Amino acid sequence: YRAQGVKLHDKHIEIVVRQMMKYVEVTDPGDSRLLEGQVLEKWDVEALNERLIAEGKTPVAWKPLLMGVTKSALSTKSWLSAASFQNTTHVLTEAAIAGKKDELIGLKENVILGRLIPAGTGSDFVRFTQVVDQKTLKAIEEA
Amino acid sequence: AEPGIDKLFGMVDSKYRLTVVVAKRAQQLLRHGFKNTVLEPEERPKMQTLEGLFDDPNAVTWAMKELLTGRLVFGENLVPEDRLQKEMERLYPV
Amino acid sequence: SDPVRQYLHEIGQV
Amino acid sequence: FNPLYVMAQSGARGNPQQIRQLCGLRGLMQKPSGETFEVPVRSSFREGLTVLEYFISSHGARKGGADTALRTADSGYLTRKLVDVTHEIVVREADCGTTNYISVPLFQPTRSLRLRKRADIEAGLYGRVLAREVEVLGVRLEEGRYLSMDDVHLLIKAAEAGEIQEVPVRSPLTCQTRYGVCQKCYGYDLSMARPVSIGEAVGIVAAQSIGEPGTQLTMR
Amino acid sequence: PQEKNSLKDLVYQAFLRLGMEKTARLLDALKYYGFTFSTTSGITIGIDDAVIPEEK
Amino acid sequence: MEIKRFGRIREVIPLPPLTEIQVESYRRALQADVPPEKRENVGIQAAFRETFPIEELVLDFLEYRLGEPPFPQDECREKDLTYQAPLYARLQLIHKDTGLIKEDEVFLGHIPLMTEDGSFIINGADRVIVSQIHRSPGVYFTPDPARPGRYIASIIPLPKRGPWIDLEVEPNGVVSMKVNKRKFPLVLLLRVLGYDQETLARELGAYGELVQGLMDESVFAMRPEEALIRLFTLLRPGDPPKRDKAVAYVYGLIADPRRYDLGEAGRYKAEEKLGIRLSGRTLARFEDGEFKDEVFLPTLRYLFALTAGVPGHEVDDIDHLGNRRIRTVGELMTDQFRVGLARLARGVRERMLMGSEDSLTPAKLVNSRPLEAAIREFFSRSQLSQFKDETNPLSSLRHKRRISALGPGGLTRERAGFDVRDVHRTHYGRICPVETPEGANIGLITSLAAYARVDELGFIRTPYRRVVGGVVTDEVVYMTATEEDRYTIAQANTPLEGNRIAAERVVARRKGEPVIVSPEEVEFMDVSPKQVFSVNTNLIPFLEHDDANRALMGSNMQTQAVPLIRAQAPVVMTGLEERVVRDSLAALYAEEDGEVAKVDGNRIVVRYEDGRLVEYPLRRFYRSNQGTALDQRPRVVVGQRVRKGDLLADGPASENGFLALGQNVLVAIMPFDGYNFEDAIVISEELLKRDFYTSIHIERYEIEARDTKLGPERITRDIPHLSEAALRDLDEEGVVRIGAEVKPGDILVGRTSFKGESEPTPEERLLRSIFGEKARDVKDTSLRVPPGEGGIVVRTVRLRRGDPGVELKPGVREVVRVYVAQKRKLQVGDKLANRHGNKGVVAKILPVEDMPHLPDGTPVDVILNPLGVPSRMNLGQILETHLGLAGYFLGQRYISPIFDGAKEPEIKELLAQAFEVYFGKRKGEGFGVDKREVEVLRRAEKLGLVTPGKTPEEQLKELFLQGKVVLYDGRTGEPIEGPIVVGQMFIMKLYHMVEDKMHARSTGPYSLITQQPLGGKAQFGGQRFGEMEVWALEAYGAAHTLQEMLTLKSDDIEGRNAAYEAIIKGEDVPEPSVPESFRVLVKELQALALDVQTLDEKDNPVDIFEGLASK
Amino acid sequence: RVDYSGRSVIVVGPQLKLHQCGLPKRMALELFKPFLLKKMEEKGIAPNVKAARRMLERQRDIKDEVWDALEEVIHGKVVLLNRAPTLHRLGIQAFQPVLVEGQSIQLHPLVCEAFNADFDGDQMAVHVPLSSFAQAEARIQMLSAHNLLSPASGEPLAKPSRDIILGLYY
Amino acid sequence: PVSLETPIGDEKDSFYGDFIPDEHLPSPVDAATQSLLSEELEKALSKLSEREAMVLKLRKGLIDGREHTLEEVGAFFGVTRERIRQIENKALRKLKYHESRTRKLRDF
DNA sequence: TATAATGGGAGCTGTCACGGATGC
DNA sequence: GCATCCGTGAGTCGAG
């Protein structure tokens, strides 16, 4: 980008790379129900480990996995988001076999359902904010 | 630019919260026909017509101007929804 | 592959 | 005060090479095979080209048009891929509480150690939160500080003085927020030059910000 | 003299120091005067305005 | 208004007829003017002779004939039918073994006929068959992309006329043939042909290591027929080897002329390449007893020779224009004719087996339908059959000269790479380097060069003058690229004294490479610069000063120029302007010397010298394909004596025979108040006052009244529930009367239609009871004026079911067509462009008093921003402006030919002559130098524009020669601080106009499967909010705006109805609901065996169908 | 595809404030049509809604009070302008509509860089956000004058362009 | 019949069926007109006594599906069939008189 | 409701780039 | 463990 005279902040590319690094590969299952070679999200395996180390069980051995942008997009947890990207057949078949449920965490799924997106003014952080005036505030303050 | 937009952005921790507040307040002003306004007669948003100045029909201009005065209070879990709706429909029926 | 050819082969058996 | 000169210099319109083609020589031309002709175009656009010169030049023009045409689809496709990868990423919370961070180099490996270019350091620093306290040039930049452009220029000045080597910074790479990134790891919302508001959809912004210049990206 | 870069730095610095609104006003003003002065400036392109150097 | 021309160069040959490609191609294909016995066995005759005789009873082919058209061209245009001729075929049915023959002439249906200008008429609409460019048939040798040493041979026939064949020497060390994606040793095939180890090793053993891989003992051990059967199992598994079927298959693959067909060009290329001669167009022969081969052995020879490094063997260039040919309209039509004919033949055999085998005639044995269907298919729906561009004469003329790489057998737009899109060196003089689409089609859609001609073989040839010694002969040779590569060709600009070369060192080309050469070494010379470029490109003066991209834009945009009611040829032409009008058949000319008898707006009657009195009807205000009005106006007066070729009447856009695409306006180049910012243009109202840039546009409206099960749709005057105000402009029969002015909402044609089965709602019935009124059984279907349309009604056509000459499609009672014309003045948002690629929309119309003006009272017409010039690097507009100024004050026009034309000094002289008129008369009028002019002169002195110390007049002349004049601000009266370039530029108004483009919708039609709004202005549809716009909203924080789009503004039914009602009542819009197209997704997913379920937080199902989909 | 959306050819208004755009009257009439029927009923222009709509269905049936009523309708409101392709989020921006005659949309110069629009015949789409929520979102978040800096690099986006720099430099 | 998937243009982006409007489902304007009508007719029947309105609602089908015979309206209210016809006639007269002055039902 | 008739017929080529799996 | 095969997709608008 610098070569062509485009100023672009590193943070964005970092946002993408972060998603490229999202997945890991199991080296040893340990006490888990997992198996050698199985691929899953880094968050899900660390949540598993921190759970079973508190259960006094052997941790799951794993190595980091770098996959490109397309494959990372298709490997997402949400099947509505994956089916709408590409490989509509493969995604749908594997997800329908797995009996997958889409928890609607992202923007795409919510867009397809026509739901309010979980971002901006649809963010739970700002969504439930209420407005009132001192007159009505005191009027309700009475009771 | 919306007048005093920087102060409005100063009022909240997230710009989107400012948006939610303004929008909700505007819905309140629309429901009750402006009877509930925290603006005094001289502060009322005006609109030039053929005959002469009238009250600004736009509820968002209003809501923002009201917000600029400290006369509004916003936040989460201030009042249950029932109490708010009912008390506002009491003091200002429509 | 080529169902007509297949049926025309199965036919040639009898 | 010449018009061509003034326009090129002000930034209104024009660059040195185009003005060169106007008053200078058009320059070397290239075959469809990619190898250049040994015979340059000696004419300016003022003097006017010979029909052979013109024809020799049309190759590069055609290759350029076909290049833009074929590239737009690749840029767009990339953009859509990026959007589908980053879409779920939004600013979910204020702090994930991570003690992790990244360390931004102010120098790069002629084989030696030399300062980077200002533009680069700015593009890696500006509007970010320090993950550790730094003391340089008698100034304390505290942990949690969002670096202003002036904070950056200061850090560069300190690096020129040998006081600072790398700058510790909160980054999306190290952010522990689930299904997104937090406010501190992100830093400024560069559009408002102030810390990002919780709820801004960061992924889409990253994707679009990467993809948009892609049409201007050189070659194929 | 004021070129693309110095005007860009001006707009940015105005954004930082003054408001968003005031920067918008500064923008509108710069637009107005820029156009106004560009009109009467006498900027034009003739064929003789592309000057072949004697060094060529 | 005299016309002065520049340039040294004299053209030894005129441009060929520009439509000759189309016209001559089709003429060769039909052979309609040739008596049958003299026909050449090409095109249609060739297809007939190729299909017949039909074996088994034998049906042979005697001949064919084309009758005259059932209807004339205009009548076909009006009646929405095809201009065509009946095709009869004389055929004899010979019964084998009865010796009996029955001759009959069988009617085959109709073949479309090309018109004078090279276009067609299909179902009433003018069309154009576009020439396709493709890889020429033949034998090629290409470098193997796998390994450096090896090479791959390819044998290519005509596209539908046979399979491709590859020859490759493997790493295995054996020679392999690839056919139908099946690879087998070439050995076996060679053995099939009667070849022996000895015969092969003798000639082909010159290279031993390579030939030893061709040697397989087990193959030569087999009998030739044993090699035949061995091959048949390999090619098609699943079929039994059969001596009857196996020979028949391999014959049809290779030696069959009716199945495998190499082009005549393929034959020639193969012969010239392999140094052999072909007896036929196949790769082998069936001549008894066994198969005999032509191509395979020499192809193998060339392959091995190229492999070893043997001299005289080189790889072919696929993009070379010797290796790429052109299939023109005639060939493309002939192919489909061959196809339909084949289907007809299969039909004939079928009908020949079935039914009585005793009594049969050619009439009973032949079904015309397949052929008719094939031709109609080709013409009506095809990628190469294109709706003709009628916008201006040059539009059509260019459209006919287009060359497409796409189409059937062509490239896929997605898969086209850099190679085919590139301009090859061999494009010189053949395919125009500048003119193509700027978009995704770039390099795929190209244009035929001016002097370029396509030969019998289909290769493009360009003319070159012969040079013997130093002398230039006037004999002209048209060469292919393959031939051109053999010589040294000098540029056309090189100095000549008489026919002798006057240059000691002359610039030339050897195989495309520019080289400086001795006059003794020159074999040939370019005819003209013109031959390098297309017709549109040749119309840009000063082209040498413009970068190729903006030149491309100018070329393309001339096509888009609309005819103006008063149109003028450019003040600076290229000299090609008249010939373009001539060839395009825009205008009307005198056939012989003679005297003009009568002159009318409608007609021109001319008496010739032989006493014959000929009458020429003028086409007046006819609607073109693009809706631009095409009308001829008389250029002569009663009693005027005219010679042969003299102009009788002017074409739709032309001025006195010269091609006029636009207006000549007085421009000032200078920024004006941000109104010209970023390519926008400032226009003076003085242009609208004098009707400059005003054009006529006719639109056609059509309505059908049909027969319904609910009763007839009637077209009448009385429409239920309408005021007299609405019907005041209506005809007594229900139509609108000619001359009326129609505005949006008004009724063009009244139509009543029987209501569907009615289930009156209780409210409706109670209302009826309250008002005690008719409750009519008919509805108003009447065709009204669309939003943003209107004009004066020029014509009406009315066709009814019972009529003397009228046939309608079944169920239709009547058809009514109203024609509505409008006169469009230039308005803000209309697109303007010049020939150098400068384009922009008018952003402002200032009144004359605000306009910049000269020292005398004359205001400038147009103001163009100079900021557009440097980046774009097209300087031709500047020169055109200078010379336009000179020609403005002198009162003359100019011709500057393309690369040979006016230079700076000559223009400077013309500008001096101009200044003498401009400033000179001012002194005699008793006026000196103005104070403002003095100040401006001081500014210019500081700018180094003028020399210090000279008199004011000397300095003003100094500026004027630089093309700059003092200009006064119209608003102020103060002068512009600098002197400004001002002069006449030729600017045209394009077909893109806001009146057409502006569209808006609140609510409207919705689609069937998905309740989403329709697209397009015509359907009154909504704008598209795409994935990227959705991204734009998500990137902002607007959740509610986005959801509102998705749900509320489209595809949510309850939501949209409730929203409209909410706004109508003045209450805020309801919360969004489930989008219908998601339900569509759910059900379309349930059609597949997958089950989709919306759930709670408790993982309990939620019904989004509200119980309607569940028991 | 959505309702309440138009499209037309853009043309530069130099006179507009940064937060404004010119909107053709004929576009505005159709885009805001329901609001206009309502406001026509709020005045003495039409007996009811159906009468008002029946009045707007013909060009010759439109009065002068209709336009002033339209001016009342759009007061304070914003519309979204969009130019294809939209590469980043600034491909859509919010403006206060200023009714202009003629059929062209007037665009402000300083936003031309962000849309990558020029006057060579570019076209733009207009969308009317309906609810108070959508209007608040557009006015606060998407307003042209509220976005002066690139989200990509913190550098300014709306900054003096060609003619403006030209004048100031001069 | 013809295929709704029949290509439009030489690109891959258009189909025949995309140009076919959906007639069946009511328009937002249509639905608004009906919804406004029910309200104006409910406003008009309020000027009537509750019996006049109820008689007129009963036998016009405004309530409970199909219209009722005036013999059935008579058994409902407890009057003679002649009375119900008369109550309907007087109610209609009241509606015509009222509507004549207001002109709010002109939308039909 | 009855001579006997017993294995089809066309095809259509100038991308690619990975990738995931399959096969030496 | 490498050569090969198949399957998938290749920017947006507008108009046809």
Ligand SMILES: Nc1ncnc2c1ncn2[C@@H]1O[C@H](COP(=O)(O)OP(=O)(O)OP(=O)(O)O)[C@@H](O)[C@H]1O
């Ligand atoms: N394929 C496109 N996608 C998006 N915008 C386009 C496209 N084609 C044209 N435009 C827009 O219209 C402007 C000018 O149009 P352009 O000169 O490219 O041809 P056009 O007017 O669209 O159609 P035509 O090729 O018939 O002239 C462009 O600058 C661009 O903004």
Ligand SMILES: Nc1ccn([C@@H]2O[C@H](COP(=O)(O)CP(=O)(O)OP(=O)(O)O)[C@@H](O)[C@H]2O)c(=O)n1
């Ligand atoms: N198929 C297409 C064709 C065009 N476009 C768009 O239209 C513009 C024209 O570019 P352009 O190169 O013609 C003019 P510009 O970019 O302003 O350069 P200049 O003014 O300095 O001379 C592009 O910027 C694209 O956004 C598109 O998206 N898809």
Ligand SMILES: [Mg+2]
């Ligand atoms: Mg531009």
Ligand SMILES: [Mg+2]
């Ligand atoms: Mg443009």
Ligand SMILES: [Zn+2]
């Ligand atoms: Zn974090």
